[PDB]
Amino acid sequence: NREEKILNREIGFAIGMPVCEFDMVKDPEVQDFRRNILNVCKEAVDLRDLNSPHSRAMYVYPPNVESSPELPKHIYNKLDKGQIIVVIWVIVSPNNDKQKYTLKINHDCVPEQVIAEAIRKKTRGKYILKVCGCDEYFLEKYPLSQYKYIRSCIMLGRMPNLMLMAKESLYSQLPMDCFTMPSYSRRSTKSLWVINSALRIKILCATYVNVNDKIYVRTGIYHGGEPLCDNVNTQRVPCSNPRWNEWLNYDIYIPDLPRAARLCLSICSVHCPLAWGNINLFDYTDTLVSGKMALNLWPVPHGLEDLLNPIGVTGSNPNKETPCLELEFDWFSSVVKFPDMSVIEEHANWSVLRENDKEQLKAISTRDPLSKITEQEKDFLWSHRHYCVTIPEILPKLLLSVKWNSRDEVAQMYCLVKDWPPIKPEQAMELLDCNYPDPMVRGFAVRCLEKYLTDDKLSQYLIQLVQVLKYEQYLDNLLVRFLLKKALTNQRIGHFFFWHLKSEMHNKTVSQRFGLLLESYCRACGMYLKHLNRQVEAMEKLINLTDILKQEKKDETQKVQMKFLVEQMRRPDFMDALQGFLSPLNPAHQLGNLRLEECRIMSSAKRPLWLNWENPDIMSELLFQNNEIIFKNGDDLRQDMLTLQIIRIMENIWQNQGLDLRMLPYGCLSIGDCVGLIEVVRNSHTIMQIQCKNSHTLHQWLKDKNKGEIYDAAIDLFTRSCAGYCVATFILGIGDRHNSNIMVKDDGQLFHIDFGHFLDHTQDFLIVISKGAQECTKTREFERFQEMCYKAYLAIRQHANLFINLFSMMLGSGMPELQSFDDIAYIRKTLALDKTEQEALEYFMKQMNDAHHGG
Ligand SMILES: Cc1nc(NC(=O)N2CCC[C@H]2C(N)=O)sc1-c1ccnc(C(C)(C)C(F)(F)F)c1
């Protein structure tokens, strides 16, 4: 009717292509995916609408809290006998008069326990605490130290500004929104293990094979990246008539193919491959493909080594002009189905010590997921299946020991997975990579993922959990139903879940899968769809604004380029879309009225856009009066977000161990095709600008801005904020540390800025470390700059598996740095976990003393 036709237009605006364009898809899987089996996401809507409007407040404004309630030991010493001073504001007045209160509370006070003391001070479930200057609310019962804002105040010794609002005022801001089902929501066999035959797949011809010496098709059965059998060749034929009509015979027995087994295609010319394509041998209904099939082949491999592409996308190229290879897979005069779990469980049951072996299990468990496991070690893990259960973290290595060529082994391993003890979520994430493709294995991780991930940990790893959706071979699966439910229960999760999918829409390998996912999110996200629509039109206004600035690239600032930006932002169509919404880079920051005098274009080779937005809050001055965000268009920001996510994980590990590393990872998001946003850090200047364009001017600026008892802190933190970025630069192999890539805050805290590429491709810093000494090396303060570095990598080395699992997931992301696992070998190269950290230290000095010529 009218409302359904109305709703379907902004949904197509928020995703970029119409909803009706999904109705013309002929694929039964796509239409079946959109049907009511996936619209059970109404359970998310029913959950968030259950205890309205409190549940709608929790959904719209989810708490930004910490994973661990317990405060670090060194941070607990920053308090005053377990007390934190907070300023409580109660504003009841005609227009703008504000009342200020100061409280003496514990650091772990309940958010509604602050009200009791604040009201008691005023009067020597009615109010809520909002952070002054942003839309952050203390709605959930969590310790104040657990909340990110108050803990960050203890991080830097800042003053926590919290103000009082009546809960009825926030509730009135959340009108009820209901979920309505769409039009398309209305609406024996033969086992695979009973047919005694070998796998036999016919190659007929290539419709539009890319050729301009002979052409042959290279095929192989794969389960992840390992070969499920010997690859089978095809007779070479002339390029003019690539007609093959050959029934290739595979050494793999038909009642031996695993559920996730798939056939990989490769048209090769003599031996350079021409095109690649993977075909799932089964379907989402557990049906082995039969009859004639047509597949359009993807473009020339993936810049990889071997001919086939075992890991990738299982499907036909959306472009119909791509080389199309038609195949006649099977003909058994019946419908052949992969057996149910009950048959498999009985099949496995039918078939069925304190030596160094128990100590060898621990050694294999602690090894990193790139140390190749030898066959004798793989056979070693085979015979200790009943003992590998005692060590839950051996499961990733056990799943590579089992051979998927054998029906009895895979059936035996299935019974292990169901009774396998739950593991840590960080380890369970590796089970969702390109390897480990078995649906029971792939679904085991999700069950532990949904039980042990917190909302903030999910927020840190959300960029990783999205990228592993592509490693799933079907549109409907256990992982997406976990991710979709999370996005429709938390606005903060849903905000970044939406923007991460939408950023990956220009990629036709995932546009079909992500487009269906976005539609299921946009249909049930509630009133946030119009907020998201405002952000989408605000960003797409800037995307065309930056693109039209790229037309006049050869121009200077304070000129045609600068005057075009000034005049084009005063236009009511431009200006209305560019205010009164929530910042894409932070859902709690309202990008209100613009400041045309405070928005400019940087005079750099990229020319990004400095954009300044007022803070429309009655108490905006208590945090910040303006939002500064860098909108740049032309360079990919996916590498930047990954590196900045490593920094956050790196500093969190160091902080929890009593190492007061105080590095600052600035906000970063990717919103489209190499388009993104950067959270500006104010009160910070590039070193290249500090030295106006001598090797002592850097220390002078820090000295005159910190005079008296505060001079030590500008030096105490400068050493700690420079040590953390030298280790992080070398561990991650980040590029040249240009003077323009580094900025230092007013109070000595410095950080690195141009990140991106990594793992490959008399200093004014030192005089500051020695507190202005001419020879820093001989000074005592230099030993603190080195002893703290030495105590640091042990935290990274003890937690190197996390930095490996999180890197194994971006292979299917299109980022050139992480094409293969060989690019993650740099992590174990610069950390050396196979060695001992008694001897891994010596490798670190030999690298710092070679580039810096001693020290
Ligand atoms: C996180 C961050 N904070 C900044 N702060 C200021 O620029 N400030 C802070 C106040 C004065 C002003 C200045 N020019 O001194 S810049 C910045 C940043 C982050 C990432 N890339 C960049 C650039 C400039 C290299 C790029 F590529 F975007 F153009 C900048």
PDB file of C-alpha atoms and ligand atoms in Angstrom, residues 600 602 604 606 608 610 630 632 666 678-685 743 753-754, ligand 1:
ATOM      1  CA  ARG A 600      38.556  24.444   5.158  1.00  0.00           C
ATOM      2  CA  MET A 602      44.028  21.152   3.872  1.00  0.00           C
ATOM      3  CA  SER A 604      48.155  18.612   1.104  1.00  0.00           C
ATOM      4  CA  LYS A 606      45.231  14.748  -1.029  1.00  0.00           C
ATOM      5  CA  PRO A 608      40.810  16.367   2.367  1.00  0.00           C
ATOM      6  CA  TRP A 610      38.228  19.972   7.417  1.00  0.00           C
ATOM      7  CA  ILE A 630      38.362  14.982   8.277  1.00  0.00           C
ATOM      8  CA  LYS A 632      38.801  12.509   2.688  1.00  0.00           C
ATOM      9  CA  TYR A 666      41.917   8.366  16.881  1.00  0.00           C
ATOM     10  CA  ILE A 678      38.884  10.802  10.843  1.00  0.00           C
ATOM     11  CA  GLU A 679      38.364  12.102  14.393  1.00  0.00           C
ATOM     12  CA  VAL A 680      40.498  15.239  14.702  1.00  0.00           C
ATOM     13  CA  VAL A 681      42.697  15.478  17.799  1.00  0.00           C
ATOM     14  CA  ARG A 682      42.871  19.112  18.904  1.00  0.00           C
ATOM     15  CA  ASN A 683      45.702  20.757  20.852  1.00  0.00           C
ATOM     16  CA  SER A 684      48.121  18.732  18.704  1.00  0.00           C
ATOM     17  CA  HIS A 685      50.591  19.874  16.044  1.00  0.00           C
ATOM     18  CA  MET A 743      51.894  15.037  16.326  1.00  0.00           C
ATOM     19  CA  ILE A 753      49.030   9.780  12.015  1.00  0.00           C
ATOM     20  CA  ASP A 754      49.716   8.450   8.517  1.00  0.00           C
TER      21      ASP A 754
HETATM   22  C1  LIG B   1      43.806  12.561  14.039  1.00  0.00           C
HETATM   23  C2  LIG B   1      44.195  13.919  13.511  1.00  0.00           C
HETATM   24  N1  LIG B   1      44.151  15.223  14.381  1.00  0.00           N
HETATM   25  C3  LIG B   1      44.574  16.314  13.586  1.00  0.00           C
HETATM   26  N2  LIG B   1      44.581  17.614  14.290  1.00  0.00           N
HETATM   27  C4  LIG B   1      44.840  18.879  13.568  1.00  0.00           C
HETATM   28  O1  LIG B   1      45.051  18.869  12.402  1.00  0.00           O
HETATM   29  N3  LIG B   1      44.835  20.140  14.313  1.00  0.00           N
HETATM   30  C5  LIG B   1      44.567  20.272  15.835  1.00  0.00           C
HETATM   31  C6  LIG B   1      44.440  21.832  16.114  1.00  0.00           C
HETATM   32  C7  LIG B   1      45.107  22.422  15.098  1.00  0.00           C
HETATM   33  C8  LIG B   1      45.047  21.375  13.815  1.00  0.00           C
HETATM   34  C9  LIG B   1      46.352  21.432  13.071  1.00  0.00           C
HETATM   35  N4  LIG B   1      46.359  21.560  11.631  1.00  0.00           N
HETATM   36  O2  LIG B   1      47.371  21.369  13.660  1.00  0.00           O
HETATM   37  S1  LIG B   1      44.908  15.782  12.187  1.00  0.00           S
HETATM   38  C10 LIG B   1      44.653  14.273  12.192  1.00  0.00           C
HETATM   39  C11 LIG B   1      44.883  13.380  10.936  1.00  0.00           C
HETATM   40  C12 LIG B   1      44.643  12.062  10.919  1.00  0.00           C
HETATM   41  C13 LIG B   1      44.865  11.312   9.767  1.00  0.00           C
HETATM   42  N5  LIG B   1      45.328  11.912   8.663  1.00  0.00           N
HETATM   43  C14 LIG B   1      45.572  13.238   8.670  1.00  0.00           C
HETATM   44  C15 LIG B   1      46.114  13.952   7.375  1.00  0.00           C
HETATM   45  C16 LIG B   1      46.225  15.489   7.636  1.00  0.00           C
HETATM   46  C17 LIG B   1      47.503  13.385   7.023  1.00  0.00           C
HETATM   47  C18 LIG B   1      45.121  13.703   6.172  1.00  0.00           C
HETATM   48  F1  LIG B   1      45.560  12.654   5.432  1.00  0.00           F
HETATM   49  F2  LIG B   1      43.877  13.425   6.656  1.00  0.00           F
HETATM   50  F3  LIG B   1      45.073  14.835   5.384  1.00  0.00           F
HETATM   51  C19 LIG B   1      45.348  13.976   9.813  1.00  0.00           C
END
